Amino acid sequence: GPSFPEPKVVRSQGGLLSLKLSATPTPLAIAGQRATLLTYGGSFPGPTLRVRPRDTVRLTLENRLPEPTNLHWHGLPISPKVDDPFLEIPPGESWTYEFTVPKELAGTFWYHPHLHGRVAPQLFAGLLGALVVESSLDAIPELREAEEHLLVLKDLALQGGRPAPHTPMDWMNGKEGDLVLVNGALRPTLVAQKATLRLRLLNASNARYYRLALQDHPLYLIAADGGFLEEPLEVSELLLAPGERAEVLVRLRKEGRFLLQALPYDRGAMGMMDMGGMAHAMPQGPSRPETLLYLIAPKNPKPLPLPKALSPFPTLPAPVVTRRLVLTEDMMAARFFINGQVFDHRRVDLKGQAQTVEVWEVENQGDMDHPFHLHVHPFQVLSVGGRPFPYRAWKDVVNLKAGEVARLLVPLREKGRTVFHCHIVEHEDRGMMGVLEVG
Amino acid sequence: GPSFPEPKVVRSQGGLLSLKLSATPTPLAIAGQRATLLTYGGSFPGPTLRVRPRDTVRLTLENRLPEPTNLHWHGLPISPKVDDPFLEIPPGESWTYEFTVPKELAGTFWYHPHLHGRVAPQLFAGLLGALVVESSLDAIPELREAEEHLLVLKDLALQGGRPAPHTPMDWMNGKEGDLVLVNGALRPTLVAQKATLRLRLLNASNARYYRLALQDHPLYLIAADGGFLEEPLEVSELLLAPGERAEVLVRLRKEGRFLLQALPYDRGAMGMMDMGGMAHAMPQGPSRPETLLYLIAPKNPKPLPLPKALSPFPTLPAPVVTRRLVLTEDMMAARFFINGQVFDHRRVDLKGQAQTVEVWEVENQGDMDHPFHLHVHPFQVLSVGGRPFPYRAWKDVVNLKAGEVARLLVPLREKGRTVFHCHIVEHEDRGMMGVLEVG
Numbered sequence A, B: 001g002p003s004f005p006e007p008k009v010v011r012s013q014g015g016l017l018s019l020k021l022s023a024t025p026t027p028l029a030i031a032g033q034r035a036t037l038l039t040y041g042g043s044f045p046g047p048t049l050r051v052r053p054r055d056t057v058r059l060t061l062e063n064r065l066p067e068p069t070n071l072h073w074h075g076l077p078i079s080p081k082v083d084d085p086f087l088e089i090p091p092g093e094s095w096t097y098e099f100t101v102p103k104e105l106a107g108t109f110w111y112h113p114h115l116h117g118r119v120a121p122q123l124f125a126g127l128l129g130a131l132v133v134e135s136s137l138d139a140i141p142e143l144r145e146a147e148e149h150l151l152v153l154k155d156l157a158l159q160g161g162r163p164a165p166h167t168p169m170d171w172m173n174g175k176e177g178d179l180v181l182v183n184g185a186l187r188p189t190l191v192a193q194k195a196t197l198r199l200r201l202l203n204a205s206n207a208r209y210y211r212l213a214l215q216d217h218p219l220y221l222i223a224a225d226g227g228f229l230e231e232p233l234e235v236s237e238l239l240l241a242p243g244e245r246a247e248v249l250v251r252l253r254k255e256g257r258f259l260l261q262a263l264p265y266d267r268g269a270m271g272m273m274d275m276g277g278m279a280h281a282m283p284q285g286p287s288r289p290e291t292l293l294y295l296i297a298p299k300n301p302k303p304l305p306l307p308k309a310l311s312p313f314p315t316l317p318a319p320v321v322t323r324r325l326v327l328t329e330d331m332m333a334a335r336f337f338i339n340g341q342v343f344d345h346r347r348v349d350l351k352g353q354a355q356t357v358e359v360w361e362v363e364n365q366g367d368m369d370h371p372f373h374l375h376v377h378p379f380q381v382l383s384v385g386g387r388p389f390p391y392r393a394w395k396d397v398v399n400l401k402a403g404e405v406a407r408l409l410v411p412l413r414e415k416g417r418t419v420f421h422c423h424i425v426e427h428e429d430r431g432m433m434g435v436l437e438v439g
């Protein structure tokens, strides 16, 4: 096959993407070993769905798991009566998700389970795939002529040919695995044929962070989670927290082999030590460095010029309310709170008005990083930690280090009940989620 | 009382020290709190016995403990039929130790239990005291005019008003306590009246090391465990392992307060950690620094000159045998071995000839420091770690860091069966001891 493995793509046909996917235990070969994973469509990752604005998506999910499941269309600003976080599909039953792709939308999204209390084991076991909304901006020559690849960043641990079970410490920290994979492959080689690469990046891990750096090269950020930036932004590295997406241009500077690495990053995970008094919690410290892939540049690379502009970011109306959402932890209990409470699907926590804009100040009073996700209503990050964000783009996950406040501008779009939660999915399963009702 | 607490002294009378001591649980005040310790003579430390060469010692030990006990006359080159490591005194019974102090002897010795398998809890709980053999060398003016003090270095931990029980990790590492005491007092003040101090130092701890340093001052070593050096040796610090003794002169240089500290020292103690894989053993690292006492210098101090010479060290006959004793560990089992075996009181390990000299090469193939002690037969340390020792003096404990070989010259003195063992007494109780028979 191609040197660089990527999920099989399913494209809409005549404006319609109509697909049946089964969620099923499936034996496959991964990373050189045989294992049984839980997959969509028989593969890990699941198939990439590729659509255009105004397409209809009709996706029938057949549940062939031994427990209930559902889908979250992560990042899509659609109705929460479709992207329904409270729906349960029982074992053996099916449900059809049908929606229209919004007109003003572009970027890399993804789909995965969202059945409260069971997300972390289901996502860890292999249930996820990407959704790409292609744009008329993809026709500008500086993007059209780039070589495009999707990179699904997802780690795994195997025991006895199956995904390793969650331990109590995994529920506290979020589970990370020793197999650090790209598109389900272990350290694949990308032999570039063009000097400019357009890489769509997805962190579909439960909890692992990827502090991305390409040896000898900057990255040019052109899209965040939910849409394009206004112009490319040069960065020396790019941190992708669980659930985040980014698109970058890589301008290969000379022939050679360059490693794409996940550099050391300390997200605040904890271990336990006994040194005579004790036992007491102790920081794990930064992750060990990982090589994600080997990038081989072509001969005599001459990259395209960067695009001067991408998409202007919308002018938003003045906001009508400011909200404050404080994140705290009880690590030894593995319980996680928003404003002092754990999720309860019967309780509405915030009530807002469709088509108004809100300012959300989300404050991490814990010691771990927490990547905060809001369904249905993409947001503009204004500042995090008191530092203004250096670009304007739609996001739907924002990472908070210990102590930091993020200030978000949140236009409320579709009416209905939806949720916001930490995207360390173990923390969501363990309570760090609340309910927003938009009317 | 005097600003500097020291154990009460019992002196021989007319050439005879005849004393009844009871080993008993005794309520006392220590470090500002009430506790019940196991004591000799009603005190912690026990009374200091002070004798001269050729004195007779007649000590009746009455056992008022709930378990058997005995005495080891640590460092005295007397008969192992008196200093009998196999003798058991049952609860409520008494035994009289009677011996003559050897003619060619001087220094600081001590007494403590040596009933195999029960040493560590009995010593930790308070059962120990010092024995001083005074010398005609003490009359030379450079020692006579010095101010003399004994410093018994011994730590403790209390729980519920009693010595803290041993945990499994204590049996592996040797138990250290958070109360780091001098003569049973917490950080006492020594207000010096003379400019030269002669300090007798005893490490009577189960396992704690004392890396001794006096602020702003060197120490002048004048005696090791079992006798004088040939001349004073200037040192910037002095490591005293469990069971070791030293005598030093301190020459106070100016008015002021100087701390005597136990500086950080890593003896190889281990803890346990769980960081996601695990649980696995991890080094504790160096001890935290401790202040042992506050030393107040007098006004306008003018120290005496040092003695030019002390005692010539004996010329020993050429040795007739070389022995090799290899120390190893099974830390997770808390088992400790010499040449692959644990102690067995029925098994003789070495057979030597009285009045010959032997070379013992003791090799630490473990990762912890081990302070190796031989009963009855004081030795001359030639080298440790391949470094020649910088002085000649009688020792009876030699500390080995991980990997190090000590080469000892061992004149065999009294006939009979005796033992050698680690003086981390938990390691002796857990097997690191063997039997020497001299005939």
Ligand SMILES: [Cu+2]
Residues within 6 Å of the ligand: A072, A074, A112, A243, A423
């Ligand atoms: Cu998600």
Ligand SMILES: [Cu+2]
Residues within 6 Å of the ligand: A072, A085, A114, A373, A375, A419, A421
């Ligand atoms: Cu969600």
Ligand SMILES: [Cu+2]
Residues within 6 Å of the ligand: A336, A369, A370, A371, A422, A423, A424, A427, A428, A432
């Ligand atoms: Cu979290």
Ligand SMILES: [Cu+2]
Residues within 6 Å of the ligand: B072, B074, B112, B243, B423
């Ligand atoms: Cu001893």
Ligand SMILES: [Cu+2]
Residues within 6 Å of the ligand: B072, B085, B114, B373, B375, B419, B421
């Ligand atoms: Cu002994």
Ligand SMILES: [Cu+2]
Residues within 6 Å of the ligand: B336, B369, B370, B371, B422, B423, B424, B427, B428, B432
């Ligand atoms: Cu030892």
Ligand code: NA
Residues within 6 Å of the ligand: A022, A023, A024, A026, A040, A041, A042
């Ligand atoms: Na299938």
Ligand code: NA
Residues within 6 Å of the ligand: B022, B023, B024, B026, B040, B041, B042
């Ligand atoms: Na008593």
